[model samples]
Target: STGSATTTPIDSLDDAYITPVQIGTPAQTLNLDFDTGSSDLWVFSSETTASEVDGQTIYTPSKSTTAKLLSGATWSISYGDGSSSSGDVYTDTVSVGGLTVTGQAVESAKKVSSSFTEDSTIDGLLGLAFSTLNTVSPTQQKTFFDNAKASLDSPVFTADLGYHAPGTYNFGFIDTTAYTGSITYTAVSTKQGFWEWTSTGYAVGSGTFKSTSIDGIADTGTTLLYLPATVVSAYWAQVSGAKSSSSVGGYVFPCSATLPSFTFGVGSARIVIPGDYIDFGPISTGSSSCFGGIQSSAGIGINIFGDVALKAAFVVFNGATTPTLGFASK
Candidate 1:
């Protein structure tokens, strides 16, 4: 079987990509951030504290005949940014696009961090990572993708993220017309419960390619690209007024500064992120300083190849016994 759905950027900076999901018998529709970085199909539900709820749509399990409580099962998680959410679990019919899964664990949030409470655009997060990352105690749960893979034509899914326009997430099959040239396949390490892999190297604009091997994770949930400090410096050095700012907390520069395109290697394939994408809009309304999409991982341990990089190519998340990743220009 197969499924497909449209994904759209929440904001002009590609802050996050959201896709619609339906849960329960009556199908409570919630637009969730399709997060490849974490595992937990969590949503704001009737269980959520009324004070914690803002503009998000809530899932009401009691209203759905298909819902069943997972007794004594609860889950919680904190993000890299310190945002957190936690609640009990329920099993219900869940559908994303055209694919449907019966008795899928749907985490209902009872509490949410201020950041999640403030960002009203997204109602919840749909995890696309390996099920091993799920946080449910007593019995962890499978991700939506994991539960649906067994019946799919192929154990794979593709992310076709767009710049500012809407994109697509296709399941069970690959669309040949979505990309150009041949795909460069790279082995992925799921031991970390992430789509972790290595990139051959990178180049700043037309500069010579650096042959350093960079280890990173393909995290669609993340907002930007993160590389080594040296690499980030090299890329921004070409810009006239760019600098790492303490107050800004990232690489920022004069709004008019020219940004050079960034390219990274996956085997012999080179995926390029247009210079325009590097400029993640101005720092604030009517401000002259602009934040960069490519920032220093700053030895935070792992480089993040996020939406900034994924949007530049067509990505395949293969879920075979020995799962692999594929990248190709779009």
Candidate 2:
């Protein structure tokens, strides 16, 4: 079986992509963040503390006749602060787009941190990462994509992200109409439970491509593109008056500055991110300075090819015997 769906943006900066999901028997529709960076299909539930529940919608087990509490199972994940989101587990009918998985492990949030509570746009997260990354204790849970893989036409899902617009996520089969030219496939390293790959080189605008081996995970959950400090610095150097600011956060420059496009190599294929997309609007309303979408990952440990980079091309997360990532220009 195959399925397709539209991904609506949560904010102006395309902070996150939320898609509609049908859970339980009577179909309790909840808008969830389709995160390819994690592996836990969790939701805000009736068990969640009142203080932790902001404007987010809840998955009330009592309302769903098919819901069942998974005996002796629980989950917990860390937050930016010391606080954590810990909760019990349940099994229920979960459907995304048109694909349905009966008795899918649905983690219910009993406690959530302020950062998630404040962002009421997303009810929960439907993690598409490998099952090895699941946070559930005792028995790790399979992601929605994993559970549906067996019945799928081709154990794969394509992400076609758009700038300031809704994107598309298709499961099972690749949509040839979504991209141009041939698909460039790269071997993915799942050893770290991420869709990690290495790029042979990168170029700043029309400059020659530097043969630097840069490896990073393709993370749709993250908002910015984080790369090596050396690569990022070289990119910003092309922009006039661009500098890293602790106050403005990361790299910032005059709003009028024309930015050069960034090109990252995927095998021999090159994906170019428009300069306009690199200029991530002003830091604040009508501010003279704007934030840069591409940032340094020096402090973060691992580089992240997040939304800022992913939005530039059509990405395929192939769940085969050995996972591989497919990228093509759109």
lDDT of 2: 0.90
Candidate 2 lDDT at 269 equals 91
Residue 156 CA displacement from its true place in model 1, Å: 0.2
lDDT of 1 by residue, 1-330 (tens): 899999988887789988999899888999999988899999998999999999999999999999999999999998766799999999999988889999999999999999999988899999999999999998999999999999999999999999988999988999999999988999999989999999999999999898889999999998899999999999999999899998988999889888899999999889999998888888889999999999999756889999889999999999998999999998
Tell me the lDDT of candidate 1.
Answer: 0.93
Clashes of 1: 0
For residue 200, give model 1's deviation from the true position in Å.
0.3
- For model 2, the superposed segments whose C-alpha errors exceed 4 Å read 79-84
In order, the Cα lDDT scores of the candidates are: 0.93, 0.90
| Clashes by residue pair, model 1 | none
Tens digits of per-residue lDDT, candidate 2, 141-253, equal 89999999999999999999998899999999999999999899998999889899998789999999998789999988888899999999999999999999988769998
Candidate 2 C-alpha error for residue 249, in Å: 2.9
